[PDB]
Amino acid sequence: MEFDYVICEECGKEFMDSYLMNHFDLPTCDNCRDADDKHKLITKTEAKQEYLLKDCDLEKREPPLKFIVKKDMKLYLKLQIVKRSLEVWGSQEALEEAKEVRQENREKMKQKKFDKKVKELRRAVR
C-alpha cells in the first residue's frame, strides 16, 4: 500500500512511522528530525503572541495545525506556526507592520491609562 510509505520532505527517503508524522502529520523521518532548531516546539501562547495568530488561524485554516499536550500547555511546531503566519498575513512585511502597529497601540494605551490614574491620584490627594 503506497499510502503507508511516506516520502521524507528532508532526505527524500520513505518511512512508515516517525515522531513528526505521528504527532504533527509532518512527513519528516526520525533521522531528519532537528528538535533544537527546525523542528522545535513552541507554546500556543508564544506562537499566538509572536506571530499574531488567532485560534481559528490554527484550527480552521487548512491544514489544521496539530499540537502535543504537555503537563497543561499545547505545543506546536514553530515551523508550522511561522508558515501559517505568513499565509494569514500574506507577507513577512505585512506581519512586521502589524506587530509594529500593535506595539505602538499598546504603548499609547498603557501611557494614557497610567497618566489618567496619576491625574486621578493628584486630584484626589490635592
Q: How far is the CB of 103 from Zn ion (least distance, A)?
A: 39
Rounded distance between C-alpha atoms, residue 60 and residue 86, angstroms = 16
CB of 27 to Zn ion, least distance (A): 9
Instruction: Say if residue 56 carries a ligand binding annotation.
Output: no
Determine contact, residues 27/38, Cβ cutoff 8 Å: no
User: Shortest gap between Cβ of 5 and Zn ion (angstroms)?
Assistant: 13
CA-nearest of 29, 106, 45 to 81 is: 45
**11 touches Zn ion (CB under 5 A):** yes
Backbone angles phi, psi at 16, to 5 degrees: -105, -40
For residue 91, give the amino acid letter: S
81 sits near Zn ion (criterion: CB under 5 A): no
Could you give the CA distance from residue 108 to residue 40 in angstroms, rounded to a whole number? 34
Is 8 labeled as ligand-binding? yes
Binding to Zn ion (CB under 5 A): which residues in 84-103?
A: none
Question: Where in 17-56 is the site for Zn ion (CB under 5 A)?
Answer: 29, 31-32
Task: Return the range that interacts with Zn ion (CB under 5 A); candidates 6-14, 38-46, 91-99, 115-123.
Answer: 6-14
Angle (CA) 34-38-42 rounded to 5° is 105
Contacts with Zn ion by CB under 5 A lie at: 8, 10-11, 29, 31-32
- Numbered residues of the known binding site for Zn(2+): 8, 11, 29, 32
